[PDB]
């Protein structure tokens, strides 16, 4: 029930804000807290504020490079980290709770810190019990997602983690597997997006 | 700063075991600590309060226990969609602090790979540059050895590999090959071969095709 702004691409020296709200109730009736996850999968807790008595509460750690901040009228969280460095590269996490009731976390907002620009993939088709599949080559930032058939087509589907070719652009394929009765059948779409580049494009997979 | 030093780092173990993982405090935080369990591309998701207290939802074969310093999670069914990183967590005095973790990988059958060779997108081609893939397909255990061989010669330093996480339903990986050469390079070759040795085959298997056939 969680939403977090978009991935973001961030100059060194630069800052950045992250916004987080709920759907359906407000976050801000409820404890919220930060937490950044880098080095491969690991954890830190940021700070949280408390709904019913003013301050927010930080990591000494993260004691000037982190500010949040809350807007109770719109229920939306903010983390501001400014001064970014490589080693703010990280997915960050708001997380909501009560009490010992709830404890549920967003999905997540990676941050590249890079001076780089911003650049989609192509999409190349991977043609053809069958497999088939999408080569998603040249992008940058981290992360894209894929997916196919529009959702519809989950079983089998396989995406490799992403690979930093030397070109310093990220490169990954998605696969799937399914009857080769079904190749003249069925059509197969992969649906490629890149947030950062706003770049969305659906390829159509077909036997060569 | 508490620390939370966290082991094993890293276990693997068949579906229906009991496993045990355990948290050291560096200063008794009572009861105030929490259990994580954080699945392949998935936000963690807390399992435990207070030590010993489950979240709803949370099957019964995940427990808590201990205090001061010392915590234990125990999974008591081990099942393949268990697969995950754990992680504890202290919250009894600021700031909050995380363990290392804990990588659960859970111990299956051999299972031989499924070799699948794609040759580049003739669209591909036409920008310059030709990828051809080799996709190794639900095996276990994860180590594998590809070799890339074109016309004969085997290869080095133009491919790269990618592997999945273990699948929650069959427990097994896959695992991809790609091979990156010029327009040019490509177009030099016919014979493209993507050779697959796995302790799963009793002889390594090749899937390879033609160039423009
Ligand atoms: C979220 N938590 C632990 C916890 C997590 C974050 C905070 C926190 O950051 N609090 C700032 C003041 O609101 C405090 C406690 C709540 C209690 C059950 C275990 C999970």
């Known amino acids: 029930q969680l939403l977090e702004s978009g991935p973001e691409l961030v100059e060194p020296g630069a800052s950045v804000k992250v916004s987080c709200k709920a759907s359906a109730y407000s976050i801000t009736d409820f404890n919220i807290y930060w937490v950044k996850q880098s080095h491969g999968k690991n954890l830190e807790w940021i700070g949280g504020?408390?709904?019913?008595?003013?301050?927010?509460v930080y990591n000494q750690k993260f004691n000037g490079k982190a500010t949040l901040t809350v807007d109770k009228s719109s229920s939306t969280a903010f983390m501001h980290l400014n001064s970014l460095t490589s080693e703010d590269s990280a997915v960050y996490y708001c997380?909501?709770?009560?009490?010992?009731?709830?404890?549920?976390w967003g999905p997540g907002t990676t941050v590249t810190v890079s001076s780089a620009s911003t650049k989609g993939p192509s999409v190349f088709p991977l043609a053809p019990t069958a497999a088939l599949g999408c080569l998603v080559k040249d992008y940058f930032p981290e992360p894209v997602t894929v997916s196919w058939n529009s959702g519809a087509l989950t079983s089998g589907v396989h995406t490799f983690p992403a690979v930093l070719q030397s070109s310093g652009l990220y490169s990954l394929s998605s696969v799937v597997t399914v009857p080769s009765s079904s190749l003249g059948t069925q059509t197969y779409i992969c649906n490629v997006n890149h947030k950062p580049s706003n770049t969305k494009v659906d390829k159509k997979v077909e036997p060569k | 700063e508490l620390v939370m030093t966290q082991s094993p780092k890293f276990m693997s173990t068949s579906v229906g075991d009991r496993v045990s993982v355990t948290c050291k405090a560096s200063?008794?935080?009572?009861?105030?600590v929490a259990w994580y369990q954080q699945k392949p591309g998935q936000s963690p998701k807390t399992l435990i309060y207070?030590?010993?207290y489950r979240y709803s939802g949370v099957p019964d074969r995940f427990t808590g226990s201990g205090s001061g310093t010392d915590f234990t999670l125990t999974i008591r069914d081990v099942q393949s969609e268990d697969a995950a990183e754990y992680f504890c967590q202290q919250y009894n005095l600021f700031p909050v602090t995380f363990g290392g973790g804990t990588k659960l990988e859970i111990k299956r059958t051999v299972a031989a790979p499924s070799v699948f060779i794609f040759p580049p997108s003739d669209e591909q081609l036409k920008s310059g540059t030709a990828s051809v893939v080799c996709l190794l397909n639900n095996f276990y255990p994860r180590e594998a050895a590809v070799a890339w061989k074109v016309d004969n010669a085997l290869q080095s330093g133009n491919s790269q590999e990618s592997v999945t996480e273990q699948d929650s339903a069959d427990s097994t990986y896959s695992l991809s090959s790609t091979l990156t050469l010029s327009k040019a390079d490509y177009e030099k070759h016919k014979v493209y071969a993507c050779e697959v040795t796995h302790q799963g085959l009793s002889s390594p298997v090749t899937k390879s095709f033609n160039r423009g056939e």
């Open positions: 504020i408390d709904p019913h008595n003013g301050g927010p």
């Open positions: 207070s030590a010993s």
């Open positions: 997380a909501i709770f009560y009490g010992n009731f709830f404890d549920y």
């Open positions: 200063q008794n935080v009572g009861t105030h």
